[PDB]
Amino acid sequence: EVQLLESGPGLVKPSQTLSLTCTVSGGSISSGGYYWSWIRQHPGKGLEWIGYIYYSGSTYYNPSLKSRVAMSVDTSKNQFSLTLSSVTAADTAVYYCARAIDNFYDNSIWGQGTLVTVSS
């Protein structure tokens, strides 16, 4: 009965930083057997995987995003966040947060998605 709710700005000026937050309901973000990921879907194009993060601290980032992403976990608010710097008009997409079961392939529950537009 876990629900994931992501939020953030609706529009980002170019060359600034993109920040998103996913809020976890019905569970906790400190349970051992899970890890948390971000996925984005370009309009008309295909899905793209960004990376994951454990509560312990181990992370993985897609080499496609050249050292531009950062993920963190906030236990007090029961949430984890994404940070993407130096945006361009190529970052327009829907962004989903997901929770996956550790060592179960990629059995995951995704969030509803948020649209981000990079324009002026």
Binding site: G46, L47, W49, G51, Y52, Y60, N62, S64, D106
Partner: peptide, 14 residues
Amino acid sequence: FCQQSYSPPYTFGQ
């Protein structure tokens, strides 16, 4: 869509 999770990064079909 079809997803592989053999090795990160995970990838999807078109």
